[PDB]
């Protein structure tokens, strides 16, 4: 900018190396030297797929019979098979769908250790209790949704014509579950876990009958003693049933076999495009690298091989082939540049010149722009390393020179 | 609801004579870390040639586990009597995390027959029997060991040949040594090899026809079978569970050798195990054949962190049990076996509690009345109690509304109603439930403007 | 590689630069370090040495074989991993890692590059020769 | 007598291997730190962008970036420590010979 | 509406559920003992 | 832990970790800074002596 | 010693790894520095 704040001179940052030290210097003028910048991205040149393919994950259980009551959701676990949330969405009026800890485009395109269902009636009119920050009866002694993994929840109507599923008499839901302690003085609330069932489910019918039933059991004293108490509560049922469906997906306990479907091209194969570097999406892992056909180390059925920093490193693929997996390498840059005549080379340090007057293979690595001279120096600017040094020709290319 | 065939037609039990004494046994077998006794493999990944730490569910190094021993049953000659066994259905155990067992370690030795100390016999690979649940108490005549509701049963069967896995609702029959009926002692399984382990057609249903014999089988929800190829080899067993239900792991089906557990199976049981116990067997063996059968050992686990050595094969020969000692500390802290010699520090020993002391403020009851006489004020004009120095129970106010809709910020659920504070303040007016997203804290509107607004 | 990353990272200020001036200033350190101290340890005048050098005083330890035999054995015994100044990124790809941890290999993971020493082996020897051969007269 | 000195107890050879060591310490940090997430869901950027929109991707990839930025400068600390140490050395050298 | 706001440390934190007490969480039974501690709200580990 | 639920408390505990995590680097760093100055300091009392 | 602390302070990597180790080193210099040190106080011969 100058002082009239007109821009007259720019400089690219991304159009070659002796850019990239400008602008990291802030500056036109830089002194001579040899500098590091940015690396010489390798780029992927195609991608690797390879998902579970096959079964359909099956949500029928869902869709027959009388759905449980919040306290008694049933649970689908689906490992293995292929998802679509759609199948299952497009069944119900869904009156309020919500994701937390994994974005909605996410929710139905990843790939998942496992997605696990919970099911259950529930009044539209209680809608907020399932909230994490609600301290009302459904989350403290009914249904709570994970804190750990992330979770969705869908809150749906039954269309009139999805007669394959029936309505129970009446909402139902524990307002109370506590334990009276042996001395008869101390009760205990019991609250609900996370993905997991009230204590006092084994008490509390599968409907209850009328608000304010009270249940009670005697506990033995492998239990801790004392009695296992809970109140029961009711809600009018509605014309339509409320549905609740709670969502969990786990990322990373086994293959990620829960996926979309996707069909398939050859040309995402691996065998089709070793050597290369490739975005890679395997079981639902994902980076960038360089398959090699190699010898098989590590256990067969684990499929995915790890290192000592947990890269993945190797892969038994379905093809029956085992596959070393290297990152895509950068190529090392670095600058050798001289002030005096405004000219520059550039050396890839420790790259054979097959990657890249044409390039110079020198001990130090590959280097273009410099031209071979056989000629000695004591009094070295440049050097390049090991007994190496850019000579400027002085404006010409700089020669390679060797330090005497 | 799956059908797992039809109920027991007997009228009666076989008599079980429980006598403890016979099996109380010293063979200690304590789980050896180095030697990579009791590991599950990492689940979801492989490594080669590494040496790194991991987390996960693992026994304690020197553990001895719990030791469960089955054995022949009372014979005369040719005619086999009463089963025997050891005080297992009564001794119910708490399931915490899971657990993992050696089965057949002894298998190949010379031992002991345990109703009869003085006979020796090779001792032969025997797979357990487990009954696993949610809630536990007595049977009818006060003995413990019943389980209620649904109920996990891993019952092997085929003579060893394979696991059979179901969950159901068990109910006692009341026949004659039945556990709803007279003289009962234990519940107990058996085979009678005689006519279930014939060379070529083995009884796959010997085990659970005698389980039946005790228990009707109810609502079950499932039923599955593995199958196991019979060998003398040890091998390793284990349970854990999780929100996607239960998972069996075992070392024969990758690891058969090395002993390593890679999970085989996952069961559909949701609700959380707390208690297990062991199904005491029995085998009806005639008094001329008796056969020693191998002890296996329970171990439980727990998440501890343990260094694991990976051979290029993957599999896990040797670890470390971090939490062991001070030298184990000192091994895992460099991720090595191997560390130079020196004077290292390492984790203090920790003073653990003892127990407990506790002081509350004891007296009055924090007095909600004014609020529930007369006309409320309007959300302007709210009126505020201030509790200092009482007793609070939220339900004693929460109970007499209908409550519609009750969140927290800055503070959980549970605490709210828990914890102790310097006050507490409530600040109450008449609000139609119509505008409740005007007292949102994201809100513009009116109501958190002009009116009222939380801290 | 990130976009979304490195616009996050542009907030953090110049943070690169700091961090490529800070070890560039670092390296170059060294190859002035380096430089001052042969220019000191080089000889005005020095003899030759030749085989049986020494005399009856055994220095055959220390003639060049050029190192010294004494002092191949010094960089023999100490276990080092090789740079690959001249081909390492191809090496780390033909044949990959040598073990566990193999912080050569990594270089072209993680991002970081190890510079080669200003002065050649060929040279230091030159230099330690010659003042082998000083140190009499 | 020294031939056969370059073991265990030789002093001057345990540094010689211990400037090596040091070296290989500087370099692992590096090449160890970057499997962490410091809180964040995953190590890998591709898996937060992939699995978070952006109010909560954001969260996440500065996770990353803290720690990366802590890891460099750390790093670069001590390469200033090491380079300022050795320095002091080399003139050490220098009056040794 | 009901608005509740909790204060924890401007005083003694005597807001507290009701506790029936047992005579084994005293502190002068325990002297010299590691013990947890809830003293009208304030926690931790330590030796009376 | 005893007031908040886990998608709070863990932002809080990590709050925590942090700030010590800060503290035991910078701890660190002047340990080996102080015993590189030790270490020099020792060298000029053997001249010294 | 709160597991919940502790679990998330494993997701900073092996932390504490590198603290014990940096100051194990920065310890181990004392010993040697003092050890050189002495060695080289120390008299061949002396006077009563
Ligand atoms: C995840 O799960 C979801 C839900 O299950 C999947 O989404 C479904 O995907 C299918 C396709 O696989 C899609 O079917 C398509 O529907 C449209 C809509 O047509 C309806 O309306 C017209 C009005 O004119 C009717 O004429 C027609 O019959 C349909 O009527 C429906 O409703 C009435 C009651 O109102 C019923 O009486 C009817 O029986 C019927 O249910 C169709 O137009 C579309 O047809 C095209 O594709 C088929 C493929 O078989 C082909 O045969 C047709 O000739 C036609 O193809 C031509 O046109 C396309 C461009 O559109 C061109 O590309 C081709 O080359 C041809 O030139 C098809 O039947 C269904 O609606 C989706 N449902 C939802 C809820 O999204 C999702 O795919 C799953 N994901 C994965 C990965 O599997
Ligand atoms: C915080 O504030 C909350 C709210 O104020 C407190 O929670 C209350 O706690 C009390 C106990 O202190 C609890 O009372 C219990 O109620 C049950 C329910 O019984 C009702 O239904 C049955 C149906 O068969 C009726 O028979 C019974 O009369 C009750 O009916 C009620 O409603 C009808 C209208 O529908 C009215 O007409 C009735 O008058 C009545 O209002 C009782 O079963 C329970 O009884 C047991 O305890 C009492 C103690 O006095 C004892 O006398 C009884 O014999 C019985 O004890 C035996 O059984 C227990 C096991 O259950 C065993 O442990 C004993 O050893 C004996 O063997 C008692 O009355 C009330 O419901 C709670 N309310 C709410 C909303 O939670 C909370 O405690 C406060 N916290 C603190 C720390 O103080
Ligand atoms: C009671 O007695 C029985 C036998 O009477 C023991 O069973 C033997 O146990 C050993 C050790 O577990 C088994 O030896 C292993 O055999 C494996 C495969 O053997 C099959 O394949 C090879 C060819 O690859 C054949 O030559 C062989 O005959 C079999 O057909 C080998 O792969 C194993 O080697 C692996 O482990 C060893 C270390 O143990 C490594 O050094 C090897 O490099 C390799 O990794 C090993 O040799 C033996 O086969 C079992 N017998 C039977 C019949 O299966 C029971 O263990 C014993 N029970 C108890 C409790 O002690
Ligand atoms: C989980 O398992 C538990 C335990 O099996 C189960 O609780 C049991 O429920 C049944 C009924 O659901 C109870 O059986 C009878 O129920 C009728 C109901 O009308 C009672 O009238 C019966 O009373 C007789 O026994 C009383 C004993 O005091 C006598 O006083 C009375 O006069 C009658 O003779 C009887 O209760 C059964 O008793 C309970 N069992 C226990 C141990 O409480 C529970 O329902 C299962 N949960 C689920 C969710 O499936
Ligand atoms: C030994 O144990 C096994 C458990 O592994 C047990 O297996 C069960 O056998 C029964 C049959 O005896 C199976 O039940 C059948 O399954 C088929 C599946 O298509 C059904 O079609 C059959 O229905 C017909 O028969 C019914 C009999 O009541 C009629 O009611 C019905 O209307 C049909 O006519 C029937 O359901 C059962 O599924 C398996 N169970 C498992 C878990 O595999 C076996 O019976 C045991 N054997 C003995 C001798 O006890
Ligand atoms: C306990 C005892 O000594 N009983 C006397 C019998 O020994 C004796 O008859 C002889 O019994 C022999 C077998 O004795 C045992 C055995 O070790 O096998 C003794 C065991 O303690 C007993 N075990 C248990 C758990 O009770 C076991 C068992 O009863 C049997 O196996 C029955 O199935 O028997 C052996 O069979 C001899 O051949 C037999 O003569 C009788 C006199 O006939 O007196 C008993 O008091
Ligand atoms: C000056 O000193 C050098 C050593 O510093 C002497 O040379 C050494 O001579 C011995 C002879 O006893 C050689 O031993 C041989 O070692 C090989 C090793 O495999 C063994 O196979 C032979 O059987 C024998 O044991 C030793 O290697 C050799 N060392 C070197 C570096 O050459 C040298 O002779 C001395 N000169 C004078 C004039 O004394
Ligand atoms: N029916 C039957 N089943 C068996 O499992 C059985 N086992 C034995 C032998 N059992 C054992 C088990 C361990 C040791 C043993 O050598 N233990 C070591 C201590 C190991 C330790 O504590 O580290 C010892 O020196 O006693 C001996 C015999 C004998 N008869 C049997 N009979
Ligand atoms: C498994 O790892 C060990 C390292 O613990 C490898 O052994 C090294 O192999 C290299 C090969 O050049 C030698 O230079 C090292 O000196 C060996 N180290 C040790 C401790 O022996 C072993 O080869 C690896 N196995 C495989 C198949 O890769
Ligand atoms: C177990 O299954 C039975 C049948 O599928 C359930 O239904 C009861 O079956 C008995 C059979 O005699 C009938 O007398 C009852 O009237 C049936 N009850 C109902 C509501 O239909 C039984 O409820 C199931 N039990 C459990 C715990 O699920
Ligand atoms: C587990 O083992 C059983 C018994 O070997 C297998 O059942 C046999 O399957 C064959 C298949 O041709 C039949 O011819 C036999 O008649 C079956 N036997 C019985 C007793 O039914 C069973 O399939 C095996 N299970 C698995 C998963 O492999
Ligand atoms: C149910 O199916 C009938 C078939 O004629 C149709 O007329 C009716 O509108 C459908 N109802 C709904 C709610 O889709
Ligand atoms: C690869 O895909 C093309 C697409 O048409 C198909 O024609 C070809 O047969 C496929 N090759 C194999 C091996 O399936
Ligand atoms: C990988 O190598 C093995 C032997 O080294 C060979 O037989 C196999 O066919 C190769 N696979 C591919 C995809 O080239
Ligand atoms: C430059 O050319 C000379 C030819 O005499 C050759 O010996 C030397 O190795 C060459 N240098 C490089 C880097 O190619
Ligand atoms: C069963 O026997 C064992 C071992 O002798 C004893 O420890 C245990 O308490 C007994 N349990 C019961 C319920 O009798
Ligand atoms: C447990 O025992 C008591 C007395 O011992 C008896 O009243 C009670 O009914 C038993 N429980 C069961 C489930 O039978
Ligand atoms: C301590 O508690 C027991 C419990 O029954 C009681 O009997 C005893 O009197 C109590 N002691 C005092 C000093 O109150």
Request: proline share 5%; aromatic share 12%.
């Amino acid at each position: 900018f100058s002082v009239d704040g007109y821009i007259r001179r720019a400089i690219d940052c991304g159009f070659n190396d002796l850019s990239q030290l400008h602008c990291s210097y802030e500056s036109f003028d830089v002194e001579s030297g040899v500098y590091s910048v940015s690396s010489f991205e390798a780029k992927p040149s195609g991608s690797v797929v390879e998902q579970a393919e096959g079964v359909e994950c099956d949500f029928s259980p869902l869709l027959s019979g009388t759905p449980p009551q919040v306290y008694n959701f049933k649970r689908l676990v689906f490992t293995n098979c292929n998802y679509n949330l759609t199948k299952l969405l497009s069944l119900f009026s869904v009156n309020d769908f919500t994701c937390s800890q994994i974005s909605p485009a996410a929710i139905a395109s990843n790939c998942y250790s496992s997605l696990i269902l919970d099911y259950f009636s529930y009044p539209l009119s209680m809608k907020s209790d399932l909230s994490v920050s609600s301290a009302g009866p459904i989350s403290q002694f009914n249904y709570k949704q994970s804190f750990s993994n992330p979770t969705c929840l869908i809150l749906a109507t039954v269309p009139h014509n999805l007669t394959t599923i029936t309505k129970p008499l009446k909402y139902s839901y524990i307002n109370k579950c506590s334990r009276l302690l042996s001395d008869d003085r101390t009760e205990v609330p019991q609250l609900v876990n996370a993905n997991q069932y009230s204590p006092c489910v084994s008490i509390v019918p599968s409907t209850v009958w009328e608000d304010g039933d009270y249940y009670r059991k005697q506990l033995s004293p492998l239990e801790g003693g004392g009695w296992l108490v809970a109140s029961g509560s009711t809600v009018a049922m509605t014309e339509q049933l409320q549905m609740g469906f709670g969502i969990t997906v786990q990322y990373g306990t086994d293959t990620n076999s829960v996926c979309p479907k996707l069909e398939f091209a050859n040309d995402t194969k691996i065998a089709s495009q070793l050597g290369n570097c490739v975005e890679y999406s395997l079981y639902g892992v994902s980076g960038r690298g360089v398959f090699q056909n190699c010898t098989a180390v590590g256990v067969r059925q684990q499929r995915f091989v790890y290192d000592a920093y947990q890269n993945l490193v190797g892969y038994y693929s379905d093809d029956g082939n085992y596959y070393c997996l290297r990152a895509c390498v950068s190529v090392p840059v670095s600058v050798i540049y001289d002030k005096e005549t405004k000219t520059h080379a550039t050396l890839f340090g420790s790259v054979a010149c097959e990657h890249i007057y044409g390039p110079l293979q020198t001990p130090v690595g590959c280097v273009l722009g410099l031209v071979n001279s056989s000629l000695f120096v004591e009094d070295c600017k440049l050097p390049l390393g090991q007994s190496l040094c850019a000579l400027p020709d002085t404006p010409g290319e700089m020669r390679l020179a060797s330090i005497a | 609801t799956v059908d797992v065939g039809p109920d027991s037609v007997k009228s009666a039990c076989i008599e079980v004579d429980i006598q403890q004494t016979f099996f109380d046994k010293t063979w200690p077998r304590p789980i050896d870390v180095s030697k990579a006794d009791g590991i599950i493999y990492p689940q979801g990944r492989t490594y080669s040639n590494i040496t790194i730490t991991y987390q996960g569910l693992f026994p304690y190094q020197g553990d001895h586990g719990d030791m469960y021993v089955y054995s022949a049953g009372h014979a005369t000659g040719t005619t086999p009597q009463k089963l025997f066994v050891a005080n297992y259905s009564q001794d119910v155990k708490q399931f915490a995390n899971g657990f993992v067992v050696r089965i057949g370690a002894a298998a190949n030795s010379t031992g002991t027959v345990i109703i009869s100390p003085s006979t020796s016999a090779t001792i032969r690979k025997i797979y357990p029997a487990f009954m696993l649940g949610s809630s536990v108490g007595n049977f009818s005549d006060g003995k413990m060991g019943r389980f209620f509701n649904h109920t996990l049963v891993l019952l092997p069967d085929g003579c060893g040949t394979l696991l059979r896995a179901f969950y159901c609702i068990l109910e006692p029959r009341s026949g004659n040594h039945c556990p709803a009926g007279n003289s009962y002692t234990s519940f107990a399984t058996y085979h009678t090899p005689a006519t279930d382990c014939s060379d070529g057609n083995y009884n796959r249903n010997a085990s659970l026809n005698s389980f039946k014999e005790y228990f009707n089988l109810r609502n079950c929800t499932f039923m599955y079978t593995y199958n196991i190829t019979e060998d003398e080899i040890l091998e390793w067993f284990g349970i854990t569970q999780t929100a996607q239900g239960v998972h069996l792991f075992s070392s024969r089906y990758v690891d058969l050798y090395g002993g390593n557990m890679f999970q085989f199976a996952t069961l559909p049981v949701y609700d959380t195990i707390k208690y297990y116990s062991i199904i005491p067997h029995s085998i009806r063996s005639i008094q001329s054949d008796r056969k020693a059968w191998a002890a296996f050992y329970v171990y439980k686990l727990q998440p501890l962190t343990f260094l694991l050595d990976f051979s290029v094969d993957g599999y896990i020969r040797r670890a470390i049990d971090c939490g062991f000692n001070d030298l184990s500390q000192l091994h895992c802290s460099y991720e090595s076996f191997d560390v130079e010699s020196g004077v290292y520090s390492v984790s203090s020993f920790e003073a653990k509690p003892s127990g407990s002391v506790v002081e509350q403020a004891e007296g009055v009851e924090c007095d909600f009345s004014p609020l529930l006489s007369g006309t409320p004020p309007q959300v302007y004009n709210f009126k505020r109690l201030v509790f200092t120095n009482c007793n609070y129970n939220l339900t004693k106010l929460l109970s007499l509304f209908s409550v519609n809709d009750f969140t927290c910020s800055q503070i959980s659920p549970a605490a709210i109603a828990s914890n102790c504070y310097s006050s507490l303040i409530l600040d109450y007016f008449s609000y139609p439930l119509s505008m409740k997203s005007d007292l949102s804290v994201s809100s513009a509107g009116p109501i958190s403007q002009f009116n009222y607004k939380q801290s | 590689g990130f976009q979304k990353c490195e616009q996050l990272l542009r907030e953090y200020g110049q943070f690169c630069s700091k961090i490529n001036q800070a070890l560039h200033g670092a390296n170059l350190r060294q190859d002035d370090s380096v430089r001052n101290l042969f220019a000191s340890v080089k000889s005005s005048q020095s003899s030759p040495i030749i085989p049986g050098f020494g005399g009856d005083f055994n220095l055959t330890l220390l003639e060049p074989v050029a190192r010294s035999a004494i002092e191949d054995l010094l960089f023999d015994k100490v276990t080092i991993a090789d740079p690959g100044y001249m081909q390492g990124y191809d090496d780390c790809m033909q044949q990959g890692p040598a073990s566990a941890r193999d912080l050569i290999c990594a270089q072209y993971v993680a991002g970081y590059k190890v510079l080669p020493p200003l002065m050649d082996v060929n040279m230091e020897a030159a230099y330690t020769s010659s003042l082998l051969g000083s140190i009499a007269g | 007598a020294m031939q056969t000195g370059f073991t265990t107890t030789n002093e001057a050879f345990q540094k010689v291997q211990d400037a090596v060591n040091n070296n290989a310490q500087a370099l692992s940090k590096l090449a160890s730190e970057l499997s962490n997430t410091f809180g964040a869901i995953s190590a890998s950027i591709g898996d937060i962008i992939q699995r978070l929109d952006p109010p909560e991707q954001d969260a996440q990839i500065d996770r990353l970036i803290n720690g990366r930025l802590t890891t460099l400068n750390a790093f670069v600390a001590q390469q200033l420590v090491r380079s300022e140490s050795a320095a002091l050395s080399a003139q050490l050298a220098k009056d040794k010979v």
